[PDB]
Ligand binder design. Structure first.
Ligand SMILES: CCCCCCCCCCCCCCCCCC(=O)OC[C@H](COP(=O)([O-])OCC[N+](C)(C)C)OC(=O)CCCCCCCCCCCCCCCCC
Ligand SMILES: CCCCCCCCCCCCCCCCCC(=O)OC[C@H](COP(=O)([O-])OCC[N+](C)(C)C)OC(=O)CCCCCCCCCCCCCCCCC
Ligand SMILES: CCCCCCCC/C=C/CCCCCCCC(=O)OC[C@H](COP(=O)(O)OCCN)OC(=O)CCCCCCC/C=C/CCCCCCCC
Lengths: 84, 248
């Protein structure tokens, strides 16, 4: 019967490894939230980057020609040197 | 048959000294933790239940059940029947019921039932009950007028574990003061359970009246007043030394 007790004692020997695995599975389930976090950050920080990085970050969809007709810096509407 | 005990012949089982390392190989395999694993998709995920999926089943081996009798060198008698079912029913019966109580020992038989499956020499209370739960076993203890029974119902592959747990109740229980004090709750629950069953409650009234203040008239359940004075680990141990023995 001591053998049985040995098995019952030993079935929890690896508690630290099992609790680590538990938390590793909670973190695995939280990785998908990155899909929304990262684009939201770049969405809020877009105005911080320089124009050439704005263009590259959007694969060229955004460029200087895409700035609004009334740019917040009116002297730079239509380009850095103005419309004409 | 090597020994005749109280009119029945038993086969004597000799004690043997076995190294703990050798026996450990024979203990049923089970786990409490599943740290990782090997992923495997359910192969029958697309198979309806009406289609058989098992092939090459070994031919069955049927034997007519027979009751067999054996006894250990310490005097514990062993009786088993194998009906070839898949669930076992282990039962330990001790010849110590309420009828053997003296008036100063009122309710001690019920108290023994209340402290069942608590801490033993080689296992804690929590570890015993979590092992019973994880392996899917059910059971308990019931104290009667002439005997007290410990029973477990389990899948038969885990019999080695179940037998050890049941025996530990009578071999070396630690009747620790704080564990016993936590069992005072069960007395009130036992009364409620008894009184709910009107047929059984009337039966107890019959026996108390039929046998006035003697063996079969002793109350089955301990009261929750003055009886709690001797609801102690020390008192329970003294009672067990009087009546619990391998011969009974
Ligand atoms: C198998 C598929 C592979 C997928 C990836 C590769 C193929 C994708 C499809 C083709 C495009 C290839 C990439 C081209 C990009 C060109 C960008 C560019 O030059 O833009 C111009 C801009 C501005 O350059 P410019 O100012 O000189 O002007 C460009 C010139 N004109 C104006 C004419 C267009 O440059 C950049 O923005 C350069 C950005 C480079 C970024 C490199 C990142 C590398 C990875 C960093 C990892 C950081 C995390 C580390 C983690 C550590 C571990 C935890
Ligand atoms: C393991 C192998 C992996 C690859 C497998 C093969 C398939 C993929 C291979 C792709 C390689 C080819 C990439 C071509 C890039 C051309 C960039 C260019 O000329 O930009 C000039 C533009 C414009 O240059 P500009 O700023 O000088 O503009 C001049 C404008 N005019 C003419 C009016 C004066 O530059 C940029 O916008 C800079 C950033 C570049 C964009 C980011 C890197 C390239 C991304 C490629 C995406 C491909 C997907 C399909 C298209 C998506 C958009 C609809
Ligand atoms: C759970 C708590 C959450 C708390 C969140 C707090 C609120 C966060 C608000 C997010 C704001 C995002 C940034 C907005 C920037 C706007 C950019 C913009 O419009 O640009 C204005 C104007 C544009 O000028 P241009 O001539 O085009 O040239 C600039 C360079 N190319 O100027 C800029 O772009 C400058 C922008 C500078 C942004 C600096 C960003 C970095 C700041 C670091 C912050 C670190 C915080 C750490 C907090 C730790 C707390 C424990």
């Amino acid at each position: 019967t001591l053998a049985v007790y040995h098995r019952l004692w030993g079935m929890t020997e690896q508690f630290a490894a099992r609790k680590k695995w538990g938390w590793r599975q909670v973190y695995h389930r939280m990785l998908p939230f990155q899909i929304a976090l990262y684009p939201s950050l770049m969405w809020y920080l877009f105005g911080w980057f320089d124009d050439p990085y704005k263009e590259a970050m959007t694969l060229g969809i955004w460029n200087v020609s895409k700035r609004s007709l009334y740019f917040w810096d009116p002297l730079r509407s239509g380009g850095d040197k103005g419309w004409y | 048959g090597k020994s005749t005990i109280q009119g029945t012949s038993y086969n004597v089982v000799k004690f043997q000294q076995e190294d703990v390392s050798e026996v450990v190989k024979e203990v049923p395999h089970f786990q409490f933790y599943y740290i990782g694993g090997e992923h495997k998709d359910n192969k029958y995920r697309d198979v309806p239940l009406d289609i058989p999926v098992l092939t090459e089943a070994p031919p069955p081996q049927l034997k007519k059940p027979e009751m067999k009798f054996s006894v250990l060198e310490n005097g514990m008698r062993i009786v088993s029947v194998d009906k070839q079912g898949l669930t076992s029913n282990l039962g330990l019966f001790v010849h110590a019921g309420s009828r053997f109580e003296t008036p100063a020992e009122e309710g001690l038989s019920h108290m023994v039932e209340c402290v069942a499956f608590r801490s033993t020499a080689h296992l804690s209370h929590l570890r015993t009950i979590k092992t019973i739960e994880v392996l899917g076993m059910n059971g308990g203890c019931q104290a009667g007028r002439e005997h007290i029974m410990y029973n477990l119902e389990l899948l038969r592959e885990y019999m080695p574990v179940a037998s050890t747990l049941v025996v530990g109740n009578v071999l070396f229980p630690r009747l620790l003061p704080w564990e016993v004090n936590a069992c005072h709750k069960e007395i009130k629950k036992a009364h409620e359970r008894l009184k709910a069953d009107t047929d059984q409650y009337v039966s107890e009234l019959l026996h108390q009246t039929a046998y006035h203040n003697n063996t079969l008239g002793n109350a089955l359940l301990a009261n929750e007043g003055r009886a709690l004075e001797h609801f102690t680990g020390d008192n329970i141990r003294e009672f067990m030394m009087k009546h619990f023995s391998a011969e009974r």
